[model samples]
Target: KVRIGVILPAESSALGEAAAVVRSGVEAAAQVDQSAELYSVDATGDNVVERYRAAVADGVNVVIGPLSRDSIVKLAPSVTVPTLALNSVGREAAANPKLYSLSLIVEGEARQLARLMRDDSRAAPLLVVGGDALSQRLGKAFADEWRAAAGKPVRQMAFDANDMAPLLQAAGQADAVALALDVAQAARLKSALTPDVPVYGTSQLNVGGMQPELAGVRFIDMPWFLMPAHPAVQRYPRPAAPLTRQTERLYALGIDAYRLAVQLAGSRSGAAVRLDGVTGDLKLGRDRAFERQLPAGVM
Candidate 1:
């Protein structure tokens, strides 16, 4: 049997529900790979490293987990077996043969938004971002990708709910607008903007379900959430309960994690594989990180 070890937070932790959803996906994949034996552990306590070591000692050929960014970094250096971290570890962990990072980062979505805008022939795209950390990150990522693609540098303004008059005034100069805001905010922004200007954003603009107010806004999201007809999505079990956009994303990650593990087991070391996962089209990058290309849609 192929033994796979899964490490995640305890049920009492903040990520408990997310961890459970991910586990369900993993178990669903395990059903297909009948030869796979899963060994799970809670990575919530101070003994995280010890727990990881224990999994290796238990003869697990592969390990997946430590969902938190901090926990993953702590356990990265000591990892012996081929492992997949559910979170990114920045450049420090780059090119580590044994470690592969995968995540649903907003930056990736923002970059995809930039590409979408460019494809639409939006020459002067304006960025409207919220003050939150996620929004800032998304906006910056979009700008960087836009500039790299040779698109003209465009105006970027912070959203002010108290006074959007300034933002709307600046929007007059642009052919398109890109949002780094939440679903409600995106809806509000869309309503306020002129109908002639096209708008684009990341998956943040989508809640778990579709909102009619968001119609005509172009965004990129996971196939599992947006395209139910996708083959990989059809192969997996649907969540028993409703999940937020972020939690559903983690669940998709879990499903792909199992498939990736199985692929790694059968292939030669360092052989790259591309998977049309529920989350996106996944491929391992030179940094040993799995980068996902999301599917775009107009919502």
Candidate 2:
């Protein structure tokens, strides 16, 4: 059996729901791989070393977690087993060949968005609107990537969730308004922006479940579910009922992660494998990161 370890937050009361979502993915993925079992552990902030030691003692061949960015940073250098950190923290630890990270960071989306904007016929000075650290980071990343890809600088504007008037005013000067907020926030901005301008944002914009009224806005997203209709999504003998919206997408992620890990385990060829997965065609990047491009459509 191939044993993998999953780590998540158990100490943060505010993030209990987020922890559940990740655990569901790990569990669902385990169910699909009969030869696979997940040795789960909780890093409750303080005892990460002990928790990690326990997982290692469980004979896990590969490690897939420790979601807290700081925990990953602290535990990564000491790990001997192959590790696929769920966040983007350990990218600089090149000295440790056994450690890898599959981060669902907004940075990748920002880069892709810049490329798309540059190629669009209407692409030009873009305006960004949002509040919060995540939103601000995404906006900076979007500007960096778009400028790098298009060889031109993009303008941006930030607005506090409490004060959106400046964002509404800035929208008049740009070709498109790119929202760096969740779906609910995007919907609110969409309502405030000029109807003539096009809008776009990352995947979580859809997760906030704010659609319909914002039908005119476009989004760049990577959801774990909604793979049933995707041609690249793999099938198995398991019944469909157990594979609810929550479980099925994660199962696909697990299956693909295992398939790719097995292929690259010895050679450290994380970026070479080519597989049509639940999201789309996936390949390992030179950065040892999994690059996924989900099909986009005008909605």
Candidate 3:
């Protein structure tokens, strides 16, 4: 499902080139059904912020990329045209009404998971977050979304993850639980939990294939991987060389980012975007941040 390009500044290498593959998807997409003239820049080094300005300086209408969150946050004032920062920024980023945070950040997926939990009639779900940075980010995002929606504080805990007793103490009390931990951490946690209580997770837990330790864990993920049969997905060719699931997610995002840029490019005032993006079903939130509501799955 990797097909798509627009202005993209990515980590430029053996490891860096993995992310660099994003431009391939973007380029392929433009060849498929180019909405407009696609463009590129040489941000071979880490100067993505300067590249954004350079693209604008060259007269491209809508700009995309500057993949690093730090650069995008710092780039708030530099946004003169319609820009879609490939990474999502939260509370501390900056104040800018012009830029749209359009990336495959799992936070949006985690946020959407909260709503699904509520919809499933589970009011009090325990959030079990791992101690690592990725886990913490998803944990906080889930917690924040849950609190804002339910108007009630959600129960949560962080763990170094060796002990299961404290987790048991909390899980037994709640009707549902959401784990922000990754594969191995979650598998260990789920194995000890009671079966009566429904379990949930973000895409972090969906490793394309799950171990038997995580049989009944319900979770959310991109339709690109989840729904390869989808019409929008079927049109695009995957990478010439196979990519890791993480980079593949970016390739999918690159496709939608280009399509989204086209949509944004076409719109003048209130044209209403309900695109069935490969990343997820996309809709513009009030703050101009595009939210991704991923599809649900069970393993």
Candidate 4:
């Protein structure tokens, strides 16, 4: 049997829930591929070395997760098997050769959005807003991308999650407002913003079980649950449906991961594969990170 291992963060409450969703997707994928078995472990509470040691001891052939940026940096060097890290933190690219990072990073999404805006010939003034430090970093990354793509600087603002009215007021001054906040923060910002403004958000805002009210604005989100008709979805013992809003997309990743491992097992030549999942087409890049596809939407 092909063995896969998982290492996810369960310390942050929100991320813990998200980790569960990813675990479900992995489990679903395993059920479809009968010859595959996954050894899941929680790295949320422990240090990176501890987590890596645990996974290595399990003798996993393939690995996924170790969610935080810092955690990944510490564990990546020790990973001997093919690893699929969940985040696209910068350090993952510098890790040992065996590590493969599959990301849902905001920066990647921002870059894609910048390209889309450039292709559409719409170089409108942009206003960016975010909640916490990570969100603000995402905002800066998005603004940098927008400027690089449009050859001009975009206005940026940062606000605490509770006091977003100032951000909404600032956004009212721009042609388009981009949110780098999480789903909850985005929903709150939507309530505060004037309806006349068009809003955009990164894919991280595309959480499973997301309420429909937040879907009114235009944004970039992967079609995570868009593959009910795929034959692989039916192979699983469970209902094999997108139970959560993004589960469909995550399940597709699991399927592709399994299929890809099988394909790579045959090659033995150490070349990467380009995969087209429910979200879109992606090539595992030179850094062992998958190039993300920016799936846009109007909420």
- Report, for every candidate in turn, its global Cα lDDT versus the true structure: 0.82, 0.63, 0.75, 0.64
> Per-residue alpha-carbon lDDT of model 3 for 146-216, expressed as tens digits?
99998887899885566789879988989999988878888887878887679998888766543788888
lDDT of 2 by residue, 59-122 (tens): 8777776656667668766777777666665554435556665655677777677666666654
Model 4, residue 103: C-alpha shift (Å):
2.8
TM-score of 1: 0.92
Q: lDDT per residue, candidate 4, 4-76, as tens digits?
A: 7677766464578667766776776666656666777777534756766776787777677766676777776
Q: Whose lDDT is greatest here?
A: 1
Query: Can you rank all candidates by TM-score, best first?
Result: 1, 3, 2, 4
RMSD of each: 2.0, 4.3, 3.8, 5.0
Pairwise lDDT winner, candidates 2 and 3: 3
Which model, 2 or 3, shows the larger TM-score? Answer: 3
Distance (Å) between predicted and true CA of 299, model 3?
Answer: 2.6
Please report how far candidate 4 places residue 192 from its true position, in Å.
Answer: 6.9
CA lDDT for candidate 3: 0.75
- Worst lDDT run of 10 residues, candidate 2, spans 231-240
lDDT of 1 by residue, 1-299 (tens): 67888988988888887888888888888886575889999885477689999999998877778787777767877878778788786555434567777778778888888888888998888899888899999999988998899646657888998898888888888898999986778788888988878888888888756598888888899998888899889877887867787777777889889888776655565346778988898888746777889888888
> What's the alpha carbon RMSD for model 3?
3.8
Q: Where does model 1 exceed 4 Å of error? A: 33-35, 90-95
Top candidate when judged by TM-score against the true structure: 1
TM-score of each: 0.92, 0.77, 0.83, 0.69
Error of 4 at 31 (Å): 2.1
Give the runs in model 3 whose Cα sits over 4 Å from its true position.
Answer: 1-5, 10-19, 44-59, 73-78, 89-98, 269-271
